[PDB]
Amino acid sequence: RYHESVLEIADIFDQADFIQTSDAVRQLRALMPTLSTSQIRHAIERIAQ
Amino acid sequence: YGAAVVNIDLNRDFFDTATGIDLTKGIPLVQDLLVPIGVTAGAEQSAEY
Amino acid sequence: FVPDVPEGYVAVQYAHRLFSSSLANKRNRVTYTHPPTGMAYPSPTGRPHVHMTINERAGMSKLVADNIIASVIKSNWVVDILDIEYTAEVMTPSEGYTQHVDAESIMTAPKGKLFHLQFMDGLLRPEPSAFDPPASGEDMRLIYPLQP
Amino acid sequence: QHVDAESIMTAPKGKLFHLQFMDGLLRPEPSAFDPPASGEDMRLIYPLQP
Amino acid sequence: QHVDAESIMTAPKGKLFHLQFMDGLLRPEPSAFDPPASGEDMRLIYPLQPISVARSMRAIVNHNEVDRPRGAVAPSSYEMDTGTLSRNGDLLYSPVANG
Amino acid sequence: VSGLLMVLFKVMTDNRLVIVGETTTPMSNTLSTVVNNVLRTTYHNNVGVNPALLRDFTQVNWLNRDITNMLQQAGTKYGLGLTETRLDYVRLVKTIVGH
Amino acid sequence: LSDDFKQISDPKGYLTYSVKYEDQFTKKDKLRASEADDRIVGPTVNLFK
């Protein structure tokens, strides 16, 4: 009997200086395949390209 | 008159192929970012989304 | 449009253990066994209504895939393939259907390949002429979305 | 010979159709290990009398 | 190859014979109506010991009447326990239990 | 006997030293889940055979049922390397790796 | 100071699986699944066909 859910850091920290993103990044990451370090280097080099 | 549908797509003209996006089907599709390593990635791969 | 699964239907998770070979009237029929009763149904016809979910088409053999589809037709099985991922162009009635998806292609497209389906919005379709000849046979349809 | 249901429905009265009928009593038994055939045999027309 | 009982009886010690053995589990079933064959198959020589000592698997085939063919051999669990590399570099099977 | 001796000899001198060969890191979405649980990121392109891979792929149902039962036992677990990895203490690059 | 070893890439074991087929029940056609899964599971599915 529980409810798993994303919880943005902005709702717990008060100081806005140290919070940049939202739940959105977590969602988009959940969309990603598990990534090997070599794969990650590939994505990076591709974004550079 | 006769407009069967009016959709809201991402601007193909803005997210151009120079950005490596391909909005020809409804979703963004970028090849060669998240790919298998050591074998050629399949065409029309979902990962492209 | 996602058709509702009707009243009498029994949900069945697809599993290889279900479909199997068996002797049946001097033939080696691809028998299905129904887990609520355990009864075997060698022919796709006469099978109990089955909302068969199909989480993965991994090892599913062509005899079995085809036998399932035959159950969808001959026995009104409603199968739900959750493995598929697709883009969906929405056609106006005038442009019809440029693409043509065989059942076999939906049951054998590699996991992770993006399928591309087309769907009519036939709302902009004018009434038939009052003296247009009657259409003896029916217009049937198999592929439906699971989500808006 | 196969009698299309089209002709069975649309023929003039007095045509004399020639239906065939397999007697399946002597059909060979399938090998115990052989993989299932795909497809289903279907008969559409039947006699009313022996 | 057929080993004549003559050679089996009269060979020098140290000859290495090569017996063959049909595994008849997959022999086809005769048609229900076909007339009887004349003649009787006969084996004269036999092993004293089990012969198929290397049999990982047997009868990778389906049967209509029964859930598995009689005498089908499944692969051993050890065939598939990838296990682990012990820190000493000796291989280990997976633990059967915690602790 | 002589055969065994040379086999014993050939094993006595197997001075082979494995280097990682041609491999693959298939994207997780493209793998049927039963395969995906077995796999660990990369693998050699020269996958050998192993019966544990027949799971949910062989059409012989008794075989798949048996193999599934063995692989679902706590005492055994199939896998496909890579697994263990050891970086240098200074260069921070990978060195020896299990597979 | 010594050629102590013999580097090799994809080592071959001492044991192996032989397999006799009953040709009457075997289809000689190579079987396949999705190419990704076939790359892995493929050689095995083909041996114990």
Side-chain angles (χ1 to χ4, degrees):
Chain A
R1 198 192 172 186
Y2 63 77
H3 183 229
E4 197 182 357
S5 84
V6 180
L7 181 260
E8 46 179 338
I9 262 61
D11 291 342
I12 62 164
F13 280 98
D14 297 31
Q15 320 175 14
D17 307 270
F18 309 114
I19 328 168
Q20 268 65 73
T21 49
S22 53
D23 318 41
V25 190
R26 182 158 289 270
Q27 192 171 350
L28 161 75
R29 187 190 74 193
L31 268 190
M32 295 196 317
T34 319
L35 284 159
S36 84
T37 63
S38 58
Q39 282 192 292
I40 282 173
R41 143 169 266 85
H42 199 299
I44 286 170
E45 283 177 1
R46 175 56 161 133
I47 284 181
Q49 184 182 29
Chain B
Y1 214 94
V5 254
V6 170
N7 282 25
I8 304 181
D9 304 31
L10 291 161
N11 182 8
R12 82 199 309 106
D13 300 329
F14 170 69
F15 305 99
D16 47 27
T17 53
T19 329
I21 310 204
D22 182 87
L23 293 154
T24 44
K25 325 227 275 177
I27 58 180
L29 289 182
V30 174
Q31 315 189 5
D32 203 71
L33 229 100
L34 316 181
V35 280
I37 275 304
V39 290
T40 77
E44 307 170 15
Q45 231 275 23
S46 112
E48 287 179 0
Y49 170 64
Chain C
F1 173 47
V2 185
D4 298 320
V5 274
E7 216 178 348
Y9 285 59
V10 210
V12 176
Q13 289 295 333
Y14 169 69
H16 293 73
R17 90 181 55 85
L18 300 182
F19 308 101
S20 92
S21 177
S22 77
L23 195 269
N25 278 320
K26 299 169 171 294
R27 254 169 58 83
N28 246 14
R29 293 209 115 293
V30 192
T31 188
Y32 149 80
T33 67
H34 186 53
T37 41
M39 181 49 186
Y41 301 79
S43 178
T45 324
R47 306 184 163 185
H49 301 337
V50 167
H51 181 5
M52 175 170 294
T53 312
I54 298 206
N55 309 279
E56 217 174 0
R57 305 121 61 208
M60 187 173 55
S61 72
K62 187 181 180 179
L63 318 191
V64 167
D66 277 83
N67 183 283
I68 280 164
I69 283 325
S71 291
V72 175
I73 296 180
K74 264 284 185 277
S75 278
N76 329 310
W77 272 19
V78 180
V79 322
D80 286 40
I81 319 157
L82 315 188
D83 194 283
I84 304 291
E85 277 182 25
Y86 60 94
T87 47
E89 191 174 2
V90 168
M91 317 308 288
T92 66
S94 295
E95 47 199 320
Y97 295 105
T98 73
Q99 296 190 186
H100 305 287
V101 233
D102 298 331
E104 200 188 347
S105 61
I106 219 79
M107 296 290 266
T108 56
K111 193 169 179 314
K113 206 198 84 294
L114 236 21
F115 229 115
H116 174 49
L117 307 165
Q118 295 186 333
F119 291 110
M120 203 66 98
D121 166 27
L123 175 56
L124 249 188
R125 190 192 312 268
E127 233 177 353
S129 160
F131 313 103
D132 270 16
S136 164
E138 217 145 20
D139 52 328
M140 314 282 308
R141 172 182 167 173
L142 275 297
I143 336 283
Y144 297 81
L146 246 14
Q147 73 216 68
Chain D
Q1 309 166 46
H2 295 277
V3 184
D4 52 316
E6 173 175 0
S7 70
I8 269 318
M9 275 286 180
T10 59
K13 185 195 312 187
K15 188 187 195 309
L16 194 41
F17 291 99
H18 186 32
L19 272 58
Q20 308 210 296
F21 293 91
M22 197 91 83
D23 168 32
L25 175 55
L26 291 218
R27 59 179 40 257
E29 215 180 357
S31 178
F33 309 102
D34 282 26
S38 190
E40 200 166 8
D41 294 316
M42 297 292 291
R43 171 150 217 113
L44 193 60
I45 325 286
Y46 298 86
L48 262 322
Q49 36 163 137
Chain E
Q1 309 166 46
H2 295 277
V3 184
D4 52 316
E6 173 175 0
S7 70
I8 269 318
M9 275 287 180
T10 59
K13 185 195 312 187
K15 188 187 195 309
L16 194 41
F17 291 99
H18 186 32
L19 272 58
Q20 308 210 296
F21 293 91
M22 197 91 83
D23 168 32
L25 175 55
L26 291 218
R27 59 179 40 257
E29 215 180 357
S31 178
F33 309 102
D34 282 26
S38 190
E40 200 166 8
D41 294 316
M42 297 292 291
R43 171 150 217 113
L44 193 60
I45 325 286
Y46 298 85
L48 262 322
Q49 36 163 137
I51 286 308
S52 57
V53 289
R55 207 177 46 185
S56 183
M57 290 185 298
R58 188 191 187 185
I60 309 196
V61 285
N62 276 308
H63 202 285
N64 351 35
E65 295 74 13
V66 278
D67 301 329
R68 42 180 310 180
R70 57 173 313 177
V73 174
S76 66
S77 31
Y78 307 97
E79 272 172 52
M80 313 173 296
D81 186 20
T82 196
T84 11
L85 237 210
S86 60
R87 189 205 320 257
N88 184 89
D90 297 29
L91 296 163
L92 315 180
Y93 292 113
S94 306
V96 194
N98 194 271
Chain F
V1 184
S2 294
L4 296 157
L5 275 179
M6 290 300 299
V7 146
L8 186 98
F9 190 78
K10 199 75 183 310
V11 173
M12 176 188 78
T13 77
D14 186 37
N15 65 316
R16 281 177 302 154
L17 213 270
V18 210
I19 327 290
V20 191
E22 282 179 3
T23 64
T24 316
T25 304
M27 255 160 63
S28 183
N29 47 263
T30 40
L31 288 178
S32 52
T33 135
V34 357
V35 148
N36 193 74
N37 301 338
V38 151
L39 201 82
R40 315 161 173 182
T41 55
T42 70
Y43 65 94
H44 271 38
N45 291 358
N46 223 243
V47 234
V49 297
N50 183 289
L53 289 155
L54 299 184
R55 174 181 192 170
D56 300 26
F57 275 81
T58 187
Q59 285 123 11
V60 191
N61 301 81
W62 67 263
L63 177 55
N64 159 93
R65 178 179 54 254
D66 283 328
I67 294 182
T68 253
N69 287 8
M70 294 164 184
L71 300 190
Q72 282 172 355
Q73 283 302 325
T76 137
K77 278 180 308 176
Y78 189 66
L80 227 39
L82 152 157
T83 153
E84 295 300 326
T85 302
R86 304 277 285 94
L87 328 171
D88 20 39
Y89 297 156
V90 197
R91 273 74 200 240
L92 309 191
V93 330
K94 63 172 192 164
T95 68
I96 311 313
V97 280
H99 259 80
Chain G
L1 295 198
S2 51
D3 51 338
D4 43 333
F5 295 111
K6 176 193 165 199
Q7 310 182 2
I8 40 83
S9 273
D10 316 86
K12 53 185 57 173
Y14 306 146
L15 298 187
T16 213
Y17 279 108
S18 294
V19 47
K20 292 200 152 200
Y21 306 109
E22 201 271 353
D23 301 89
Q24 181 209 0
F25 288 131
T26 278
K27 295 80 45 202
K28 213 269 173 63
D29 300 334
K30 292 180 74 278
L31 304 94
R32 57 187 311 177
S34 53
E35 243 288 343
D37 297 274
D38 180 86
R39 271 181 209 98
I40 294 169
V41 105
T44 314
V45 142
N46 284 262
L47 200 61
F48 316 132
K49 45 159 67 169

